[PDB]
Amino acid sequence: TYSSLPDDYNCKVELALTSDGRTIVCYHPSVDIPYEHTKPIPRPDPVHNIEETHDLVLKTRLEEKGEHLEQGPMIEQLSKMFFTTKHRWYPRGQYHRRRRKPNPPKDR
Amino acid sequence: TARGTASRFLTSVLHNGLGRYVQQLQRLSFSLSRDAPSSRGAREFVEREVTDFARRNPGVVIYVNPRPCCVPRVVAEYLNGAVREESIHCKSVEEIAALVQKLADQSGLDVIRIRKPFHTDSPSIQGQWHPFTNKPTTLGGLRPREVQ
Amino acid sequence: LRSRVTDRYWRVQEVLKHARHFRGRKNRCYRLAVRAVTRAFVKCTRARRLKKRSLRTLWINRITAASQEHGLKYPAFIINLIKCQVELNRKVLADLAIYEPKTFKSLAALAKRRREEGFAAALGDGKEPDGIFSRVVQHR
Amino acid sequence: RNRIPGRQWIGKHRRPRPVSAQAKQNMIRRLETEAENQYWLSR
Amino acid sequence: SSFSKAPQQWATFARVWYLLDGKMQPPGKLAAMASVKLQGLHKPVYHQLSDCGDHVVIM
Amino acid sequence: AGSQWRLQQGFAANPSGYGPLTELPDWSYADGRPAPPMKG
Amino acid sequence: VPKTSLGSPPWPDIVLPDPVEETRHHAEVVGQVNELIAAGRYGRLFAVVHFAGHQWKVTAEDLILIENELDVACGERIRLEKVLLVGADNFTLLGKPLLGKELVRVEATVIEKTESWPKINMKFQKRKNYQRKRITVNPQTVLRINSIEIAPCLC
Amino acid sequence: CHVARNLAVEQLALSAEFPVPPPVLRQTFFAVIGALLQSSGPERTALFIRDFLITQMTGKELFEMWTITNPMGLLVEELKKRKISAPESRLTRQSGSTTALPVYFVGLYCDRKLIAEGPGETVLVAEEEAARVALRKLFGFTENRRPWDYSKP
Amino acid sequence: EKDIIKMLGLEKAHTPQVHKNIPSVNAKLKVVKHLIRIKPLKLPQGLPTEEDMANTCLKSNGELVVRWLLN
Ligand SMILES: [Mg+2]
Ligand SMILES: [Mg+2]
Ligand SMILES: [Mg+2]
Ligand SMILES: [Mg+2]
């Protein structure tokens, strides 16, 4: 057994040279992740807004969540959330909004 | 200029040439004159090489219209519905033949800047690279500084 | 015989049609558009020349990334793929790096094996030992 | 702060740019080529 | 390999968090790999216009 | 790159020099009949 | 034996296998890949082929655009002879520097023989009254790669 | 309708309301198909069908046109048919869990053997994608599958 | 030096040219020896005859093969 690169990341390379010498073959079967190298799926399900008196109000207690901030704090929150700067979330003018291609080409 | 003009990707009409090749040139309408000195090349082409072209390409309908015109034209209509109007004003018979052969070989798509000189549907044979394709899995799927 | 120009409308439009996507008075005024369009065309040619270098640099960077992902440096990878008479340009190598991880890993393993063979040969200084992948095949 | 008087590579006081090992190797390679040339031009 | 378009795109352009110990390490040799991983020069799908950039946590 | 290795082995310094990658015809008809020669 | 920082080279020692065992393993691997090709257990094949001065990575039902005109008519099939590399999900054949025509066969149909968009080429010199504008129209061809076949003739 | 409009059937179809609505275009295209079947042979008509309708499946996926709703349910049903007990979902790889754009890889293990793996922005989406990948692998409609045979038998 | 390189037929760079080994040309080769690489023309299979003129090639190591790419 011999291999230039370790066979632990996604494929098992086995190189060979044809008896003629003019061709190099390489058999690389894919590598599957063993069961011992994984962890179970975490499941988080909790309903704390449920009330024993009025379930119709309990269902709305979890849906009536609302919040509104200013442009400044909203952009700061978005920047902290997406790990970016504040300058991306500011709008652009008419000159730049009118010159965007309406139907850009698509591949595949 | 690429930034001034439009662009498109390398595509084919109805997956042409995959199952069978279908000539995209549907019809070819020549409009020329019988007495104008500018339609002389078109007249000689209609006399000599329009029948040979019609026989070589039986899938294109050729119309010929002698009319009192000053600029002889050729209108190619393709299977996608594209209309390409060219002027054969004051051109030799060889030039007419070359223009008609180019129009017959063309596919009718827009002649604009092609972004990629290739077009692959699903080029991810055997897989596509993601940041996890070359990383080893640990015993238990533990993070670097995670204690089990 | 007074001769005046009658097609100046189209003479101006043929130049203004290349400036409609500009900013400022360069897209309207003719005196400012002839200069902006000439610079546009000169830059178009210079960039037509520079696009090849830019794309080759991008391919080289992608090959460095895909090689260091296998613990191999780009010069070593390239020279040891050349020494195996594998004549694949940087464009094809980057395409393989992106869409063929198994093929690129096999290529990197071949390059590492060739490098190890060259190192062992240079260390031993023996003419009778010859590596398996270090054999040179002539034209047939 | 460190100004070069006059032009950069003209005056009595120029830029002190040194010679690198790459340039040394290039010159040595050219010298080897020319030595082989003057050998082949001998007989 | 046989993924759908959106999950394939997500898996390809996903961000990765790397850890880096800086105890008894030279700041420049740390910054070299830190900047490489920040720019995304470790991805064969890298491009200057794409937002390919990974997070680096140096302790 | 690797031009010195090719010069030592005997091939051209550029893979586009008199090698089979450029001397052979790059295509032929599906029926097997030869293609017209290349201008280069 | 003294062990210092520079007493040993700063790289792991490499041990290459025996040449005889290596040749036996190569024969085994080539026979296995040949059995795979004969049984036909490969799903889809891609191929890096040299054509028109460039190298193209093409698969079945592919489209490529060659920037020069070919001496063929539209709808005609063509066998691409310079195949540098073939690959599948499980195996991969590399040429030294090319593959064998009996081993691999790539076929492509000519779709469209057209002209490129007008490319502007302008030269200009400062305050020398030198401007020069040219327009290039390049003849191009479209090739649809139809099939990439491989034969079990692999020694 | 795309195939007919590109083959110029709309220009030859005799019908009022020139747009030729999708039903009328379908009727005309399949009338041409029936005329070809009556004129030439069934083998040639099948070749025409394979060349002008099967080619529209190029680059397309299986579920893009099937549009199933319970991939995991269909997968466990197919496994019960193939005499497999049940697939177990295991989180193979993940990058970020508290961030706004996480990425998870969920694999499906039957008897502690990986059959398929799928990525997603959430664990549920990753599990659904893994189920779809396993379904495609079982049905044979994969990306690395044999391309369609366009030849003359 | 420009004129010597022009009369030696070395206007285009990186293209080999065959010359004699006589002192007449050796003088000019010595004059411009710092701009040229000089090798001896090797003939391992002899001089190309008239039936082998169209099948010859000049290898990079300096040898002129007579039968190049047979069949
Ligand atoms: Mg050039
Ligand atoms: Mg100064
Ligand atoms: Mg000075
Ligand atoms: Mg030339």
The number of CA neighbours under 13 Å toward the Cβ of H64 is 12
**Looking up tokens 């709008």, which residue turns up?**
A91
Q: Which residues contact C96 (CB under 8 A, 6 or more apart)?
A: C88, C103, C104, C107, G48, G57
| Three-state SS letters, chain A | CCCCCCCCCCECCEEEECCCCCEEEEECCECCCCHHHCEECCCCCCCCCCCCCCHHHHHHHCCCCCCCCCHHHHHHHHHHHHCCCHHHHCCCCHHHHHCCCCCCCCCC
User: How much distance in Å is there from the Cα of D16 to the middle of ligand 2?
Assistant: 14
Locate B70 and state its tokens: 């000053």
Specify the DSSP class assigned to residue B144. T
Distance CA F28, CA H109 (A): 49
Residue among G145, G151, G146, G144 nearest G42 (CA): G151
Locate G57 and state its tokens: 């990575």
- Residue G49 neighbours by CB distance under 10 Å: 29
Residue among A69, A67, A106, A66 nearest A89 (CA): A69
- Residue H60 burial by Cβ neighbours in a 10 Å radius (0-12, 13-18, 19+): exposed
Residue among G96, G78, G90 nearest G147 (CA): G78
Q: Which residues contact H109 (CB under 8 A, 6 or more apart)?
A: A35, A38, H87, H88, H90, H115
For residue I21, the SS3 value is coil
Distance CA I33, CA I41 (A): 17
- Residue C57 neighbours by CB distance under 10 Å: 11
Binding site of D for Mg(2+), by residue number, is 5-7, 13
Locate A68 and state its tokens: 């509104």
Q: Are strands B61-66 and B25-32 parallel, antiparallel or unpaired?
A: parallel
Specify the DSSP class assigned to residue H122. S
What is chain B's percent helix, strand, coil content, to nearest 5?
Answer: 25, 20, 55
Distance CA I60, CA D37 (A): 17
Ion ligand 3 neighbours, Cβ < 5 Å:
D 6-7, 11, 13
Rg (CA), chain F: 14
Q: Which residues contact B116 (CB under 8 A, 6 or more apart)?
A: A107, B9, B10
Q: Which residues pair with D34 in a beta bridge?
A: none
* Domain residue ranges of chain C, discontinuous segments joined by +: 1-140
H94/chain A closest Cα distance in angstroms: 10
Residue among B66, A56, C131 nearest G26 (CA): C131
Q: Are strands E17-20 and E55-58 parallel, antiparallel or unpaired?
A: parallel
Cα separations in angstroms, H30 against B19, H3, H37, H40: 19, 11, 10, 15
Specify the DSSP class assigned to residue B51. H
Binding site of D, by residue number, is 5-7, 13
Where do runs of H (alpha helix) occur along C17-100? 30-68, 74-82, 90-99
**Chain D residues in contact with chain I using a Cβ-Cβ cutoff of 8 Å:** 33-34, 36-38, 40-41
Task: Using an 8 Å CB-CB cutoff, list chain E residues near B128.
Answer: 1, 8, 12
Distance CA H85, CA B92 (A): 78
Locate H76 and state its tokens: 């466990």
**Contact (Cβ atoms closer than 8 angstroms) between residue E57 and residue E33:** no
All structural domains of chain B, each given as residue ranges with its CATH number in brackets, are 1-148 (3.40.30.10)
Distance CA C80, CA C84 (A): 6
Report yes or no: I15 at the F interface, CB cutoff 8 Å.
no
Element containing residue H119 per DSSP (H, E)? strand H114-120
The number of CA neighbours under 13 Å toward the Cβ of G90 is 14
Q: Which residues contact B77 (CB under 8 A, 6 or more apart)?
A: B26, B27, B28, B29, B83, B84
CA H110-H111-H117 angle, to 5 degrees, is 35
Provide the sign of the torsion angle of the four alpha carbons H74, H78, H83, H88, taken in this order.
negative
Closest CA in chain F for residue I57: F18
User: What's CA E28's distance to the chain center, in Å?
Assistant: 18
Distance CA B79, CA B12 (A): 12
Provide the sign of the torsion angle of the four alpha carbons B136, B141, B146, B148, taken in this order.
negative
Distance CA E40, CA E51 (A): 9
Distance CA B121, CA G62 (A): 7
The pair phi, psi for residue E41, each rounded to 5°, is -70, 5
- As a residue count, chain A comes to 108
**Contact (Cβ atoms closer than 8 angstroms) between residue A24 and residue G96:** yes
Task: Using an 8 Å CB-CB cutoff, list chain C residues near B113.
Answer: none
For residue C19, the SS3 value is coil
CA A65-A71-A76 angle, to 5 degrees, is 85
Q: Which residues contact H66 (CB under 8 A, 6 or more apart)?
A: none
Facing G48 at nearest CB: one of C41, C42, C88? C88
- Residue H153 burial by Cβ neighbours in a 10 Å radius (0-12, 13-18, 19+): exposed
The pair phi, psi for residue C108, each rounded to 5°, is -65, -40
Q: Which residues contact G106 (CB under 8 A, 6 or more apart)?
A: G47, G49, G58, G79, G80, G83, G145, G147, G148
Rounded to 10 deg, the angle between the C74-82 and C101-124 helix axes is: 80
Cα separations in angstroms, A10 against A2, A27, C108, C109, E7: 17, 13, 14, 14, 19
Cα separations in angstroms, D16 against D8, D9, D13, D19, G130: 10, 9, 9, 10, 39
Q: Report the structure determination method.
A: cryo-EM
Distance CA A107, CA B121 (A): 9
